[PDB]
Amino acid sequence: MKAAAKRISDGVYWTGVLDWDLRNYHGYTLQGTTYNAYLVCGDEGVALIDNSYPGTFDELMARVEDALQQVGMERVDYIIQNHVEKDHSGVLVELHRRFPEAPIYCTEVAVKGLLKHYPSLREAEFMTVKTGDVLDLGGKTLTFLETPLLHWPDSMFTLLDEDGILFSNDAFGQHLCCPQRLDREIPEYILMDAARKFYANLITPLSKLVLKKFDEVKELGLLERIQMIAPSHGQIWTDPMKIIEAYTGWATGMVDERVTVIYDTMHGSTRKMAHAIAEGAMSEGVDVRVYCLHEDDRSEIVKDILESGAIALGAPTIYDEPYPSVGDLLMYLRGLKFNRTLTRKALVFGSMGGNGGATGTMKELLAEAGFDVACEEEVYYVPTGDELDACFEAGRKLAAEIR
Amino acid sequence: MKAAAKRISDGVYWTGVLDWDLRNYHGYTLQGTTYNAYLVCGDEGVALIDNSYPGTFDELMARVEDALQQVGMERVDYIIQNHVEKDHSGVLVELHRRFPEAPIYCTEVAVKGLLKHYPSLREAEFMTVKTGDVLDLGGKTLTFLETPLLHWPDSMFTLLDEDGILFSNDAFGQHLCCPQRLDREIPEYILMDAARKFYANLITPLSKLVLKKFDEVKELGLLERIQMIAPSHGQIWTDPMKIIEAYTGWATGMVDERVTVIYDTMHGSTRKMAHAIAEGAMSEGVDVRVYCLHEDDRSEIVKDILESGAIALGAPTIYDEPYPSVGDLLMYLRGLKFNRTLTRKALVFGSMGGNGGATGTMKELLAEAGFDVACEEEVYYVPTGDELDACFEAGRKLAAEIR
Ligand SMILES: Cc1cc2nc3c(=O)[nH]c(=O)nc-3n(C[C@H](O)[C@H](O)[C@H](O)COP(=O)(O)O)c2cc1C
Ligand SMILES: Cc1cc2nc3c(=O)[nH]c(=O)nc-3n(C[C@H](O)[C@H](O)[C@H](O)COP(=O)(O)O)c2cc1C
Ligand SMILES: [Cl-]
Ligand SMILES: [Cl-]
Ligand SMILES: [Cl-]
Ligand SMILES: [Fe+3]
Ligand SMILES: [Fe+3]
Ligand SMILES: [Fe+3]
Ligand SMILES: [Fe+3]
Ligand SMILES: [Fe+3]
Ligand SMILES: [Fe+3]
């Protein structure tokens, strides 16, 4: 197969897979992604860091072969698995068959997870690693750093300290599929919006552990030595402090003045309320976003929630419950635990035809999910002018609190 | 507009609207529907029972006009509103303009409902009716029967005594849009499946009240005189006992032997578990359906739950929660209160990568929604043959139970 590797540093090559076609997975929408794998070539040893999704072996191997031919070397001597997730371990079996002599370097928890995914690796050679362990490739050394982060219990960072490259698994990732391999070769808006979305959807509940990981990195004296961050998806950071600083802001609740308004409706009354609420919020000079659960994906909604000090959630009542689509977002938000960054304000609202129940339900669930539920607007059927004014004031007040 | 009314009985015409294009509304999918309005003409007066969605006046008016010509009458004398829902009252304002001298006949609760939707009607002449009130058309009497059923407070039935026709609002409706008007003119499978779907999604939580309403219809001695049921959507029942008996079955929890399996998945492990459970259930000779939340609507899923004594629900864990799509289904089920017809058995299942939590949550929420959660199959990553055998066995045991 003809597929080229990309030299990223001396004896270090990107040898990953471009997934142009993926649009939706893990609960998340995207316009394609990459599975970044890296070939590190020392004086005496060659290490491959991570691999790719099942069925992508030929492409990954073509790039590994090209890299090797570029440096004048021939085998992979070590296979490194910073995580067990199938889009980074999906061709491990094929890799093991191709390089039978290569030990697999990973954490002890990764061994379990890898063997449960791929039982035929019962026969393979593993080298479990712990924080501070080293693999010497001759003139280059890889140091391992466990990053269990509660819910990524197999994960680790690999540090190449002579190039100052951190291979960070999914941390600092973004779902982007570009011909350009580097952060600086694409528009900054695109780069940061994808990085933002990845944080909101994947790192939010881990925010405390991420901050703790940063302090440990700083304590081992590895941070003054980051020249580059090579994540498992998307662009390589040649400006690692840009993404570290953004992450620090996201983990600590640094937001601009923004209110995200989210609703569903059947007959339009909750929609009118949502517009009046957004109108009020706008009058206070804050940024406003409006999403409709009928149309909009949860992963885009939470990207904006990350950057918002306040939200408004509205749905009509359907047999004592909110419209069922809010059950999807509320469950997601209960997993994301935004209170770990900042306990954002929440206004709940909706139309109803008799006994209601949706707004108190949403209050219950928003509070459990770590929002500070500020108040409510509940309307019988179609709102009147006065009721719409009341909606405008609710949004104005909500915007005023987060200024 | 050219559009013909369909003669149904002597001096009784269907004058509704054909909505070919509707696909999704009220949380519900369909392949089109109708808004059935009915013109009833005595020797002296003419009543119009219900109307149609906003913007559909021309079609309704044209059919009304055609009907008045066929009977040789000049105007609608009485406007009957069985319910306020905009599907059925959306051209009331234009009807009031067309027939200024016509009172509006509805329940007292319906007056508030109609005023909140249509403030201009604050001028209109209202004639509130309660159970057992009569309207005489001259050789044709309409008898009114309130049908609040807790959550349809504005609703009523209108009975035409001499012909034995029950105008049953949304009760006994189906979302079908055919050129044929009567139940016996279309395939029985289609008719009953649509009726089933309509009951499952719109009536389930009202089941005990439905049975109380049936008792009252019998107690007023009106059920013996029912020759025909004319609902607000779909086909007219020339065989009214057919749908009455099916409703009684659906309300009392009458089911054939059936398990509905429902799941979502990211990497396919929960799917392997869902298929094993399906195979285990099939080994016991019971019917099985398998739905995937990524693809299938909540309204098709609950249709089959209605007909099932047991369900299985499965999903992977993401940050301590079930995959978010189950939050939508679970919240819907919470509205529907299936335990009001029958407490069905449930099996929760799922694959996880660490601490899990999805099966715990799903067990909790299903119990809230009134299912008897009898078994829990949780697997770490990809299931072994033995773990797949245990899912098969759990499927088998669930099936055995409901025999
Ligand atoms: C399927 C169905 C069930 C409903 N159930 C309830 C209910 O249990 N309680 C209630 O107060 N309103 C109920 N409603 C009435 C709606 O909440 C009401 O029409 C509301 O004004 C809709 O707001 P929207 O314009 O944003 O869709 C129900 C409506 C439908 C279609
Ligand atoms: C975004 C993400 C978050 C996850 N969080 C958890 C978690 O919190 N706890 C856990 O046990 N597994 C977690 N998992 C791992 C999956 O639950 C595990 O891979 C499982 O086997 C998926 O099953 P499936 O093949 O049906 O998709 C997570 C996976 C992803 C992609
Ligand atoms: Cl999805
Ligand atoms: Cl070789
Ligand atoms: Cl929907
Ligand atoms: Fe994956
Ligand atoms: Fe990844
Ligand atoms: Fe209720
Ligand atoms: Fe409606
Ligand atoms: Fe209706
Ligand atoms: Fe957790």
Residue from A262, A271, A319, A349 whose mutation best tests the ligand 1 pocket (most atoms within 8 A of CB)? A319
| 3-state SS string for B201-242 | HHCHHHHHHHHHHHHHHHHCCCHHHCCEEECCCCCEECCHHH
Nearest to A252 by CA among A213, A204, A215, A298: A204
Distance A38 CA to ligand 5 centre (A): 43
B96 is in an annotated binding site: no
Long-range contacts of B90-93 (CB under 8 A, 24+ apart): B90/B51, B90/B52, B90/B53, B90/B54, B90/B55, B90/B56, B91/B51, B91/B52, B91/B53, B91/B54, B91/B56, B91/B57, B91/B60, B92/B51, B92/B118, B92/B121, B93/B118, B93/B120, B93/B121
Query: Which method was it determined by?
Result: X-ray
B265 in contact with ligand 2, CB cutoff 6 A: yes
CB contact under 8 A, A113 and B353: yes
Nearest to A382 by CA among A279, A261, A271: A271
> A18 by DSSP, 3-state: which?
strand
| A315 Cα nearest atom in ligand 1 | 26
Q: What is the resolution of this structure in A?
A: 2.3
Residue A123 class from Cβ within 10 Å (0-12 exposed, 13-18 middle, 19+ buried)?
exposed
Q: Which two tokens stand for residue A265?
A: 């409706």
Search chain A and give the residue with CA nearest B384. A116
Instruction: Report the alpha-carbon angle B1-B5-B8, nearest 5.
Output: 175
Inter-chain CB pairs, A–B, below 8 Å: 100
Distance B374 CA to ligand 5 centre (A): 30
Q: Which two tokens stand for residue B333?
A: 């089920």
Q: Which two tokens stand for residue B171?
A: 């009760």
Distance CA(A333)–CA(A325), nearest Å, equals 13
Contact B105, B157 (CB under 8 A): no
Q: Which two tokens stand for residue B276?
A: 């094993």
Name which residue sits closest to atom 12 of ligand 2, judged by CA: B353
How close A332 comes to chain B (CA, Å)? 5
Nearest to B382 by CA among A81, A50, A85, A49: A85
Contact A120, A206 (CB under 8 A): no
Q: What is the CA radius of gyration of chain A?
A: 24
| B268 Cα nearest atom in ligand 2 | 25
- β-pair partners for A89: none
CB contact under 8 A, B322 and A331: yes
Distance CA(A96)–CA(A98), nearest Å, equals 5
CB contact under 8 A, A335 and B353: no
- β-pair partners for B401: none
Half-sphere exposure of residue B175, counting CA atoms within 13 Å on the CB side? 23
A contact residues 314-333, partner B, Cβ 8 Å cutoff: 318-332
Q: Which two tokens stand for residue B34?
A: 């109708």
- β-pair partners for A352: A380
Instruction: Report the alpha-carbon angle B77-B83-B330, nearest 5.
Output: 165
- β-pair partners for A159: A143, A166
C-beta atoms surrounding A372 within 10 Å: 14
Strands B310-314 and A38-41: unpaired
Side chain identity, residue B269: S
Distance B117 CA to ligand 6 centre (A): 48
> B32 by DSSP, 3-state: which?
coil
Nearest to A169 by CA among A181, A152, A184, A183: A152
Distance A75 CA to ligand 4 centre (A): 5
DSSP string, B327-344: HHHHHHHHHH-GGGT---
Distance CA(A54)–CA(A94), nearest Å, equals 10
Relative orientation angle of helices B240-252 and B188-202, to the nearest 10 degrees: 40
Q: Which two tokens stand for residue B341?
A: 């017809």
> A13 by DSSP, 3-state: which?
strand
Q: Give all domains of chain B, ordered by start, each with its CATH number.
A: 1-252 (3.60.15.10), 258-401 (3.40.50.360)
Contact B269, B281 (CB under 8 A): no
**Chain A interface, mutation test: which of B89, B318, B320, most A Cβ atoms within 10 Å?**
B318
A275 is in an annotated binding site: no
Distance CA(B322)–CA(B315), nearest Å, equals 6
Q: What's phi and psi for A130, nearest 5 deg?
A: -125, 165
Q: Which two tokens stand for residue B310?
A: 């047991």
Q: What is the CA radius of gyration of chain B?
A: 24
What is the DSSP-derived secondary structure letter of residue A236?
A: B
Distance CA(A394)–CA(B5), nearest Å, equals 49
Name which residue sits closest to atom 15 of ligand 1, judged by CA: A353
